[PDB]
């Protein structure tokens, strides 16, 4: 019975730690996943704007080769 | 000891915090500067009101509370308000840019910038505790901060404080005072994320409170001030067992044992009485039997639902004021032979009772009549699932077309989080359905 | 605080821009010197949203005045509240666009755009917390249209996490005899649908018809049209300028008004041109829309409505509920509670009470179809294409802009036809 008593409190500690652990890891993964996604969305935005600049160069270029 | 730490998140959480802590001060005879003449133990104590107030050497009684909002204008009013001396400046935390009714911004983009600072300030309160019992978290379902930042905080609190108890007072959205079309999204996301991390959550339907102010107090167009003063009374009734002592006093944790049959089934329905104007309360005394019977009028519930079409898993009565057990028992016996009260078959039908002799209090210039006795019923009914059903339906209407979803995706979220959250809500509705079925 | 950086480009942009500042400076109780002479603290609580406070309690508009010709610049500086604007924030070229979108967007404007950005940057960096930009301009000209859409792209490169709002004035043959305007409008819309978060569609066709048919003003001047614009612009910014719960900032407005990113073109409305009931009935009436569209030819995705003045708020709630029930077919059912109501108890000047309307209606397509009708006919005609290709433009950029606006129309049609089940 003494050994059973030890196993019960050890189980409670284990499960409590496992809950803390999985919560810590689950959260860290979410914030990482969110950081990548938001950055990837902003990066795609700038890239589209940066080819509007390249396009504008090509347009001004096309006007000099117009004369 | 048994200290409780309150955390007020977002506009709704903060402004309800203002009402509650103003009300507590009047109940305990604490002045706006924090002084409490009746308290002879200067600089500390083990009294019941010390569960919510710490004490400085200068005799100031300071709320065990943190106020957090991602925008400063609501908390600024606290910093310059009547009770500004009550709080240490570090208890009042503000960012510069709110979450814009967006869960993603509250949980991720904006929230992550201030979460560490918030946990540090919470830690500072906790280390002053000799026996911390747990946290009380006030927030809206609809706001970006109330939803997003709260769920982030609750996750972090579970890591930093293990299985230490965490209670919620959650403001459930109503169209009469709604601020955003996406509040159903924010509601489902925060409910899903906080579910594992909350031990007990008291939902407050703004429409329920709105109707009570209109019908029982004759307020043509209730303001947040009208709602919050009513809400603070229900909150006060629930926390009264922690803040006061008494022979017939029953601790909130004892009620909690009865109210939560399974971890996910932790949403009690609150019903408060009497809500009555000074004009009507004059030359009219509401007896124990009358206010108790009022607890089974659905018009008096904090959440719109019909318990008469559901099943009970618990029924708790929290009295305060001039009340004795004899009258309670008589009132209950009458009610059971006249109301539609039906329990599930796996639970006993006895009503659990608590009495705090400290009478109800009202804030100056408030709409509520000062009465000699009040009661708050805390019941566990399957019917509260109706509140989930209404929210989930509104969620489905918009998500089918992916309306407004791009605001969330733009902040780093994925559609998988929406579907995961909605599936959890569907399982929760099914859970409340399963517990109501008769055993085999 | 939460600052907005105002920009006005071209003639139209500076005209309505100046009147905008005249009207709100009056509401916030500040004179053309920049000093405060009001009576209510509510006038100053959120003053920093649009104004910089200088030494000696002098409030300076956070405004940037732009044009490819120095003419209008003198007009503003000589006009009322001309001495309130920051001198350094005046940015003028000398060339002039001549209603050539290509000149404004690729050539003449591209050489002035940087000195504008320098002023944008200087204003921005001094913000406690910049929320975004609002631009006033027309789409029918060359500067406000072509350069205005260039500035937007350029600003969005340096401030991609800020809100970009615009007050775009739409061209109409009833007001301007210029024939190439449907080119400039389509080319602009091609840019606005991609790079703005919120666009208020100010339609000269609607402004004309209101003045002529309701105000009974044959031969309406730009002053008459702008009196409507100013009252409107005052209305749709009230929630930004005064203490409030609802759409209090540009981002929260966008989140409530834009269910899909491309569908961000609002038709504003104003009433009157009284009782709470008929104020409400008027603001939902087609005759009171500042966009030449019939809302009963489509469905509302979202709606924002602010009432101004002292009135029974119980009555406003009841009647806003009343309108939604009697006109339930004209609000999409797959967006619950899409109509939001605000109330500011300080009325505008002259009126004891008014109501401003902001609708995201699929009926806005009627406006884009009008422009497209002109554009498509012009494209077949190929009338004045050399002025654009002369600056280096290609014929495809015309085609792409056309089909993109066609897509916008069909997308508004898609969600108009959608059902809950
Ligand atoms: C003899 O017949 C006509 C003679 C003229 C115009 C017309 C007719 Cl029919 N029509 C039909 C119009 O609709 C007017 C319109 O121009 C106007 O904006 C306005 C100033 C008149 C326009 C050309 O379509 C506009 C742009 C292609 C613009 C034209 C310009 O402004 N610069 C530029 O690069 O592009 C240019 O040089 C300054 C002056 C004006 C042109 C000339 C060609 C007169
Ligand atoms: N009962 C009550 N409800 C409130 C109060 N303030 C806001 N709400 C409700 O809360 C919801 C909006 O969430 P808020 O708390 O205002 O927003 P937030 O938490 O600050 O999050 P942000 O988007 O960042 O501003 C709406 O449904 C409101 O009706 C209040 O003082 N009392
Ligand atoms: N409502 C209104 N519309 C105006 C006003 N001024 C010009 N417009 C319209 O603007 C369109 C042409 O654009 P403009 O602003 O005049 O030209 P711009 O943007 O300055 O470009 P450029 O003149 O070529 O340098 C026409 O369709 C006009 O009807 C105004 O004061 N009020
Ligand atoms: Ca003490
Ligand atoms: Mg807020
Ligand atoms: Mg011009």
CA–centroid distance, C370 to ligand 6, in Å, is: 24
Q: Which token pair is C173?
A: 């043959």
Does B345 map to a domain? Answer: yes
B379 lines ligand 2 (CB under 6 A): no
Q: Which token pair is B57?
A: 């050497």
Residue C138, annotated ligand binder? yes
d(CA C171, CA B150): 48
In contact, B98 and B146? CB cutoff 8 Å? no
Residue closest via CA to ligand 1's atom 18 equals C99
* Atom in ligand 1 nearest the alpha carbon of residue C390: 34
Q: Tell me how far CA of residue B219 lies from CA of A30, B209, B211, B229, in angstroms.
A: 45, 11, 9, 13
In contact, B392 and B425? CB cutoff 8 Å? yes
In contact, B252 and B238? CB cutoff 8 Å? yes
B259, B283, B313 - which closes a domain: B259
Residue of B nearest to C252 (CA): B100
Does B96 share its domain with B216? yes
Does B112 share its domain with B210? yes
Q: Tell me how far CA of residue C180 lies from CA of B32, C175, C177, C222, in angstroms.
A: 69, 14, 9, 20
Calculate the CA B385 to chain-centre distance. 17
Instruction: Give me the CATH number covering residue B29.
Output: 3.40.50.1440
d(CA B11, CA B43): 32
Does B50 share its domain with B87? yes
Measured between its terminal Cα atoms, the distance across chain C in Å is 44
The residue from B254, B284, B414, B415 that is catalytic is: B254
CA atoms within 13 A on the CB side of B160: 20
Does B297 share its domain with B400? no
Does B178 map to a domain? Answer: yes
The ligand placed nearest to the CA atom of residue C109 is 3
Q: Which domains are assigned to chain C?
A: 3-257 (3.40.50.1440), 265-366 (3.30.1330.20), 367-417 (1.10.287.600)
Q: Which token pair is C301?
A: 């995705």
Query: Helix (H, G, I), strand (E, B), or coil: what is residue C94?
Result: coil
Q: Tell me how far CA of residue B290 lies from CA of B298, B369, B387, C113, in angstroms.
A: 15, 16, 27, 75
In contact, B353 and B331? CB cutoff 8 Å? no
Does B206 share its domain with B221? yes
* Subunit partners of chain C (3 or more CB pairs within 8 A): A, B
Determine whether the interchain pair A19/B158 forms a contact, defined as Cβ–Cβ distance below 8 Å: yes
Q: Which domain holds residue B137?
A: 3-259
Does B273 share its domain with B419? no
B177 lines ligand 2 (CB under 6 A): yes
Dihedral sign for Cα atoms in the order C364, C367, C370, C376 = negative
CA atoms within 13 A on the CB side of B176: 19
Q: Tell me how far CA of residue B67 lies from CA of B161, B239, B298, in angstroms.
A: 19, 18, 33
Does B364 map to a domain? Answer: yes
d(CA A34, CA B98): 18
Determine whether the interchain pair A20/B197 forms a contact, defined as Cβ–Cβ distance below 8 Å: no
Does B24 share its domain with B171? yes
Bridge partner residues of B65 (DSSP): B6
Sequence-ordered list of residues with C-beta below 8 angstroms from that of A12, at least 6 positions apart, any chain:
none
Does B249 share its domain with B371? no
Phi, psi dihedrals of residue C352, rounded to the nearest 5° = -80, -25
B225, B259, B293 - which closes a domain: B259
Does B440 map to a domain? Answer: no
Query: Helix (H, G, I), strand (E, B), or coil: what is residue B36?
Result: coil
Does B209 share its domain with B282? no
In contact, B91 and B121? CB cutoff 8 Å? yes
d(CA B251, CA B273): 20
Of the candidates C386, C226, C216, C236, the residue with the CA atom closest to the CA atom of residue C305: C236
After which residues does chain A break, using C–N > 2.5 Å? Answer: none
Does B264 map to a domain? Answer: no
Q: Within chain A, how many helices (H) and strands (E) appear?
A: 1, 0
Does B19 share its domain with B30? yes
- Has B254 been annotated as catalytic? yes
d(CA C256, CA C360): 10
Q: Counting beta carbons within 10 angstroms of the beta carbon of residue B140, is it exposed (0 to 12), middle (13 to 18) or buried (19 or more)?
A: buried
In contact, B313 and B342? CB cutoff 8 Å? no
Annotated binding-site ranges of B for GTP = 11, 71, 140, 144-145, 179, 206, 228
User: Can you spell out the DSSP letters for C361-420?
Assistant: EGGGHHHHHHHHHHHHHHHHHT-S-HHHHTTT--SHHHHHHHHHHHHHHHHHHHHHH---
The packing angle between helices C396-417 and C181-195, to 10°, is 60
C53-60, Cβ contacts within 8 angstroms, sequence gap of 24 or more: C58/C33, C58/C34, C59/C28, C59/C30, C59/C34, C59/C35, C59/C84, C60/C34, C60/C84, C60/C85, C60/C86
B259, B279, B298 - which closes a domain: B259
In contact, B132 and B164? CB cutoff 8 Å? yes
CA atoms within 13 A on the CB side of B376: 24
| B395 membership: H or E segment, kind and range | helix B385-399
Instruction: Give me the CATH number covering residue B304.
Output: 3.30.1330.20
CA–centroid distance, C145 to ligand 3, in Å, is: 9
Provide, as residue numbers in chain C, all residues whose Cβ is less than 8 Å from the Cβ of A64.
392
Instruction: Give me the CATH number covering residue B419.
Output: 1.10.287.600
d(CA A51, CA B365): 63
**How determined?**
X-ray
In this complex, the residue of B162, B196, B411 whose CB is nearest that of residue A38 is B411
Total structural domains in chain B?
3
Q: Which token pair is B379?
A: 């019941």
Of the candidates B258, B317, B266, B260, the residue with the CA atom closest to the CA atom of residue B292: B317
Q: Which of B111, B113, B177 to mutate to test the pocket of ligand 2 (most atoms within 8 A of CB)?
A: B177
d(CA B207, CA B168): 19
Interface residues of A toward C, Cβ cutoff 8 Å, are: 42, 45-46, 49-50, 52, 56, 59-64, 66
Phi, psi dihedrals of residue B287, rounded to the nearest 5° = -75, 175
Calculate the CA B123 to chain-centre distance. 22
Does B377 share its domain with B401? no
Does B77 share its domain with B105? yes
């Amino acid at each position: 019975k003494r050994e059973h008593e030890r196993e019960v409190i050890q189980k409670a500690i284990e499960e409590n730690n496992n809950f803390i652990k999985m919560a810590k890891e689950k959260l860290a993964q979410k914030m990482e996943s969110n950081k990548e996604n938001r950055e990837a969305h902003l990066a795609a935005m700038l890239e589209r704007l940066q080819e509007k600049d390249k396009h504008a160069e090509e347009v001004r270029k096309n006007k000099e080769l117009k004369e | 000891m048994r200290e409780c730490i309150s955390i007020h998140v977002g506009q709704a959480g903060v402004q309800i915090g203002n009402a509650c802590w103003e009300l507590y001060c009047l109940e305990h005879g604490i002045q706006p500067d924090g002084q409490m003449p009746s308290d002879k133990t200067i600089g500390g104590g083990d009294d019941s009101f010390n569960t919510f107030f710490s004490e400085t050497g200068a005799g100031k009684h300071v709320p065990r509370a943190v106020f957090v909002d991602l925008e400063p204008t609501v908390i600024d009013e606290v910093r310059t308000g009547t009770y500004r001396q009550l709080f240490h400046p570090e208890q009042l935390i503000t960012g510069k840019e709110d979450a814009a009714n967006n869960y993603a911004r509250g949980h991720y983009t904006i929230g992550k910038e201030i979460i560490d600072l918030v946990l540090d300030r919470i830690r500072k309160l906790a280390d002053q505790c000799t026996g911390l019992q747990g946290f009380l978290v006030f927030h809206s379902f609809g706001g970006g901060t109330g939803s997003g930042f709260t769920s982030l905080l609750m996750e972090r609190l579970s890591v930093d404080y293990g299985k230490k108890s965490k209670l919620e007072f959650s403001i459930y959205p109503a169209p009469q005072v709604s601020t955003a079309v996406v509040e159903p999204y924010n509601s489902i996301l925060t409910t899903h994320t906080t579910l594992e991390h909350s031990d007990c959550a008291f939902m407050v339907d703004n429409e329920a409170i709105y109707d009570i102010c209109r019908r029982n107090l004759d307020i043509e167009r209730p303001t947040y001030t009208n709602l919050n003063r009513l809400i603070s009374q229900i909150v006060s009734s629930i926390t009264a067992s922690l803040r006061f002592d008494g022979a017939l006093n029953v601790d909130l944790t004892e009620f909690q044992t009865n109210l939560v049959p399974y971890p996910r089934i932790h949403f009690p329905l609150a019903t408060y009485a009497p809500v009555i104007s000074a004009e009507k309360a004059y030359h009219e005394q509401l007896s124990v039997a009358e206010i108790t019977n009022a607890c089974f009028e659905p018009a008096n519930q904090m959440v719109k639902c019909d318990p008469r079409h559901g099943k009970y898993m618990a029924c708790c009565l929290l009295y305060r004021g001039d009340v004795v057990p004899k009258d309670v028992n008589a009132a209950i016996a009458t009610i059971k032979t006249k109301r539609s009260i039906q329990f599930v078959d796996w639970c006993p039908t006895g009503f659990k009772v608590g009495i705090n002799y400290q009478p109800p209090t009202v804030v100056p210039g408030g709409d509520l009549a000062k009465v000699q006795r009040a009661v708050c019923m805390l019941s566990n009914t399957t019917a509260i699932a109706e509140a989930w059903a209404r929210l989930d339906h509104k969620f489905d209407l918009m998500y089918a077309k992916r309306a407004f979803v791009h605001w969330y995706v733009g902040e780093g979220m994925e559609e998988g989080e929406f579907s995961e959250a909605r599936e959890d809500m569907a399982a929760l509705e099914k859970d409340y359905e399963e517990v109501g079925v008769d055993s085999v | 605080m939460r600052e907005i950086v105002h920009i006005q480009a071209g003639q139209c942009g500076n005209q309505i821009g100046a009147k905008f500042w005249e009207v709100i400076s009056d509401e916030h109780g500040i004179d053309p010197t920049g000093s405060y002479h009001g009576d209510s603290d509510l006038q100053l609580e959120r003053i920093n949203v649009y104004y910089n406070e200088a030494t000696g309690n002098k409030y300076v508009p956070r405004a940037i005045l732009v044009d490819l010709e120095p003419g209008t610049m003198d007009s503003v500086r000589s006009g009322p509240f001309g001495q309130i604007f920051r001198p350094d924030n005046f940015v003028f070229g000398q060339s002039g666009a001549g209603n050539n979108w290509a000149k404004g967007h690729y050539t003449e404007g591209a050489e002035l755009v940087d000195s504008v950005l320098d002023v944008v940057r200087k204003e921005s960096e001094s913000c406690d917390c910049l929320q975004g930009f609002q631009l006033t301009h027309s789409l029918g000209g060359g500067t406000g249209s072509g350069m205005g859409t260039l500035l937007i792209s350029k600003i969005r490169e340096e401030y991609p996490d800020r809100i970009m709002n615009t007050f775009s004035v739409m061209p109409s043959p009833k007001v301007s005899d210029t024939v190439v305007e449907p080119y400039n409008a389509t080319l602009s819309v091609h840019q606005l649908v991609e790079n703005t978060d919120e666009t208020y569609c100010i339609d000269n066709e609607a402004l004309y018809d209101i003045c002529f048919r309701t105000l009974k003003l044959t031969t309406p001047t730009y002053g008459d049209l702008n009196h409507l614009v100013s009252a409107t612009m005052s209305g749709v910014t009230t929630c930004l300028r005064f203490p409030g719960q609802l759409n209090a900032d540009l981002r929260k407005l966008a989140v409530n008004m834009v269910p899909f990113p491309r569908l961000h073109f609002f038709m504003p409305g104003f009433a009157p041109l009284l009782t709470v009931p008929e104020l409400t009935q008027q603001m939902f009436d087609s005759k009171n829309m500042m966009a030449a569209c019939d809302p009963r030819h489509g469905r509302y995705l979202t709606v924002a409505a602010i009432f101004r003045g002292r009135m029974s708020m119980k009555e406003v709630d009841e009647q806003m509920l009343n309108v939604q029930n009697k006109n339930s077919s004209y609000f999409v059912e797959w967006i619950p509670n899409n109509v939001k109501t605000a109330v500011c108890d300080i009325p505008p000047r002259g009126l004891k009470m008014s109501a401003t309307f902001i609708g995201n209606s699929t009926a806005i397509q009627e406006l884009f179809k009008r422009i497209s009708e002109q554009f498509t006919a012009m494209f077949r005609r190929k009338a004045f294409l050399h002025w654009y290709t002369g600056e280096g433009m290609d014929e495809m950029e015309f085609t792409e802009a056309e089909s993109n606006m066609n897509d916008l129309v069909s997308e508004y049609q898609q969600y108009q036809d959608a059902t809950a089940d």
